[PDB]
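Input for the complex:
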Amino acid sequence: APFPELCSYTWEAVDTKNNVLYKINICGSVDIVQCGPSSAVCMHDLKTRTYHSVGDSVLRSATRSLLEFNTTVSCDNHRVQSSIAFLCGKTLGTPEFVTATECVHYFEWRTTAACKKDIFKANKEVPCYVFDEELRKHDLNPLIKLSGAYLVDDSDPDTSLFINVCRDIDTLRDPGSQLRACPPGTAACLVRGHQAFDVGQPRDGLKLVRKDRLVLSYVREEAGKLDFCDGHSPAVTITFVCPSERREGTIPKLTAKSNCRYEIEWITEYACHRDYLESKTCSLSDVSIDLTPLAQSYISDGKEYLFYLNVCGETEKKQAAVCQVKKTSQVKAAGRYHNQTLRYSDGDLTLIYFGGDECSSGFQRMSVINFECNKTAGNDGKGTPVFTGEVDCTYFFTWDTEYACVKEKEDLLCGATDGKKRYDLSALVRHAEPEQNWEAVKKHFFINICHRVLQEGKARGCNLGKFISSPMKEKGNIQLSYSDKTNITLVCKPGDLESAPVLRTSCFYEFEWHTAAACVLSKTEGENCTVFDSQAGFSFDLSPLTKKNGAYKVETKKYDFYINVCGPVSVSPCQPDSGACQVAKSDEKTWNLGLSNAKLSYYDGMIQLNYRGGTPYNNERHTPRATLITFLCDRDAGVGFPEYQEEDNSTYNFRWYTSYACPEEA
Ligand SMILES: *[C@@H]1O[C@H](CO)[C@@H](O[C@@H]2O[C@H](CO)[C@@H](O[C@@H]3O[C@H](CO)[C@@H](O)[C@H](O[C@H]4O[C@H](CO)[C@@H](O)[C@H](O)[C@@H]4O)[C@@H]3O)[C@H](O)[C@H]2NC(C)=O)[C@H](O)[C@H]1NC(C)=O
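Predicted:
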């Protein structure tokens, strides 16, 4: 019951309505001063910064699915208590708030840790959620792959980085996969043809670094063999960002990869806040869910009792959704419609019946149903409740049914891949522009790509214009299925972004478009601070960012870095030829992080600068320092500021979000 895979972390659940945050530690105690020592569940209040412990680590007991943390302080009932109802899950999960009184506090937790067979357990998994400062919940548990991995986008054809989110990669029951050669325990697998190396393992949980960005770090450390990483400990730092109209969705992209210190930006909807829904219904609402189909008697074998459940209706003393009968025939109501509560809470469907007859103790009976998704449940889809424990006369049940399976995506990307080949239509996108729409040859056929129509001649602000689903690689081309329908075929025409879609076919519609946007993406280089993508139509030019008497200053804990774009830096201690320079804030000792130059690299929306001159290190290898600046497209960032990436002591990577990297330039 004190499952190991959950110990050594302090978890968090939130009473979204009463404005309360609970900290849970199922093995030790919360590290906090303010709710004393050996508090296993520490309640605290956002109104009234008042931190009251509501479960002690020593006073711990289990009964069936429930783990119980009792206290000695009194409430009256009599003493304050916290329970967690455990269900087997597909990932490590997070405890969710169910309900509380002034005595009891109830949580539920779907986790692999409560599964009895160890096949469902990852070699190593870490918490995969954060709370922001509005207590809104960012949870990446849906991105976690139980089998396989995600290929990270990179320009190099000979090597591929594969990652999983918050756990290692499961290579099993897929022997044909190229991942098979990857050593076990790896969250981040580098393959070079036929070798497979471990460049990162799960360590700590998801962090929130600067109000909005989720950061996860894989490390290796205890391995040794810096084969081709020349002295550096391999590492992977993923940065998860919530899509905008400043920055729309992407696949995971490799923004840096020197010295086996890999950096990954990944813009995906699963990074945005999770909404906590509620109602006094059997229906909720991102997307809908309806539990009225199950009102169809349901019964569950209890301790020495039977439970009778009629959820959502009476099926025809009464007014009692759940009734308890001792197997002797005296009966008690365990919950009624006088307040029933249906919660969808970060993927968890939970139903409480708050009525109930008062028991011999001071408690008024209560019933909690945790619905689980099962398409092939039984009772042709409706399934059947299972009694899973009782505490202070609250009775818990778990209920597989197909009518709990409502798990909708819509992280629609405007690209497509085919092995390592990637395609991206972002150049066609016209977004609330001074630009017009596209017009092929309403009123006139007006088209936009992975975006609503613009009101330039005005069509229909959302005749029928669809505008959902991601594009796919059809018969040698890219197909875009606009669904209510319009099928758009886009054909690679190197160099041409100027031309428009065409006629072809009049409730079905078909357009054909020859565009450089339909060409496979590839890496290009340029000089004089410009880079020309010839298969696409255009060039990027970062020269406006070039300072004349340089210095973009970048302050960290111990260092100030001074860098310029495509020209040298010019401040007090630095050598006048470096494009990047490190000054220690206590000592003013200075390192040269590489000579400036104006050769731009460009691949799939990332522009790169590499300074390579650089003060040597203290070793036989002659190894001079180097600097990487990755420029990333942020439409409304403007010129933007550089940002140092924390790595080891000998890697100098900067990220720079700027409009000048976005597909509006020369
Ligand atoms: C970045 O800018 C610098 C200037 O500060 C530049 O050095 C210059 O390089 C070019 C080409 O290497 C030199 O020659 C030409 O200047 C004339 C102006 O009359 C242009 O017509 C030229 O265009 C052609 O240049 C080459 C000449 O054969 C061709 O190979 C090329 O394909 C073009 O068709 C070019 O601009 C120029 O004289 C120097 N400047 C000095 C002072 O020596 C540097 O080369 C630029 N980087 C580039 C262009 O990639």
